[PDB]
Curated annotation (Swiss-Prot):
Misc remark: The second heme binding site has an unusual CXXXXCH motif.
GO molecular function, one term: electron transfer activity
Ligand binding (Ca(2+)): 10, 12, 20-21
Protein localization: Periplasm
Function, as annotated: Exchanges electrons with [NiFe] and [Fe] hydrogenases and with the acidic cytochrome c3. Participates in sulfate respiration coupled with phosphorylation by transferring electrons from the enzyme dehydrogenase to ferredoxin.
Residues included from the entire protein: 25 to 138 of 140
Binding sites annotated in the UniProt record for heme c 3: 30, 90, 93-94
Keyword line: Calcium, Electron transport, Heme, Iron, Metal-binding, Periplasm, Signal, Sulfate respiration, Transport
Annotated heme c 1 binding sites: 27, 40, 43-44
Name by which UniProt lists this protein: Basic cytochrome c3
Length: 114
């Protein structure tokens, strides 16, 4: 399927405004992960490899936007999908790849959020 242009991820609206973030994400920058269907499945992990690809926060997925904890572990929350220790999350993949210092994205909170 079509690989999107750069976006700003902004699904969450932390009532503590100092901890509200709008986070740039580039499919193109992530091309080193691959461009085949399996590459897409490294993140779109429930995708069947054939259908339309959609967002992470639909019904039955990571739809709950009411936890604002970076340490959230319940997968029903969107925070978990971007932060958990799993290699499918933003923070989790970058940090797992950093285990033997493979080239990867930002691991620090502020460097990723900007
Ligand atoms: C290091 C420990 C942290 C901490 C404390 C937080 N983050 Fe992140 N973050 C990332 C993405 C893609 C989002 C989604 C933004 C959105 O959809 O609006 C967030 C969001 C947050 C929040 C909520 C922000 C809000 O607008 O409500 C909070 C409180 C938060 N984070 C804390 C992405 C990343 C990273 C990318 C690799 C990394 C690293 C971090 N976050 C790290 C941290
Ligand atoms: C492999 C080549 C692909 C393809 C074909 C797509 N992706 Fe991704 N993608 C990722 C994240 C976190 C999002 C949501 C960002 C947000 O919440 O704004 C997306 C989004 C998409 C879309 C749009 C879906 C929608 O309607 O919102 C599409 C069409 C899409 N992707 C296709 C994250 C990743 C990855 C993590 C690094 C990787 C790898 C891929 N995507 C790979 C692919
Ligand atoms: C969009 C690209 C994403 C991203 C970044 C993540 N998901 Fe999912 N996810 C879903 C379910 C039911 C689970 C639980 C495990 C399972 O039953 O397979 C998960 C798991 C995750 C994790 C791990 C969370 C943890 O630390 O335990 C992560 C980091 C993650 N996902 C990220 C459900 C769905 C979907 C339903 C079809 C869709 C679509 C997505 N997730 C999309 C994404
Ligand atoms: C969840 C939506 C995210 C977000 C917000 C980011 N990442 Fe990744 N990332 C991965 C790798 C291997 C790289 C290095 C690519 C390379 O240089 O070859 C990156 C890079 C980034 C960046 C930096 C982009 C740039 O312009 O240099 C940023 C801002 C970033 N990421 C944010 C690997 C992964 C994953 C492996 C499965 C996962 C999941 C994510 N990244 C998820 C996210
Ligand atoms: Ca936000």
């Amino acid at each position: 399927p079509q690989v999107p242009a750069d976006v700003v991820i902004d699904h969450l609206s932390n009532p503590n405004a100092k901890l509200e973030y709008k986070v740039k994400f580039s499919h193109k920058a992530h091309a080193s992960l691959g461009t085949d269907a399996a590459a897409c499945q490294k993140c779109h992990h429930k995708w069947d490899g054939k259908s339309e690809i959609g967002g992470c926060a639909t019904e039955g997925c990571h739809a709950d936007t009411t936890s604002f904890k970076a340490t959230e572990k319940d997968p029903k929350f969107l925070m978990t999908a971007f932060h958990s220790k799993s290699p499918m999350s933003c923070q989790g993949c970058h940090k797992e790849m950093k285990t033997a210092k493979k080239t990867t994205g930002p691991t620090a909170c502020a460097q990723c959020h900007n």
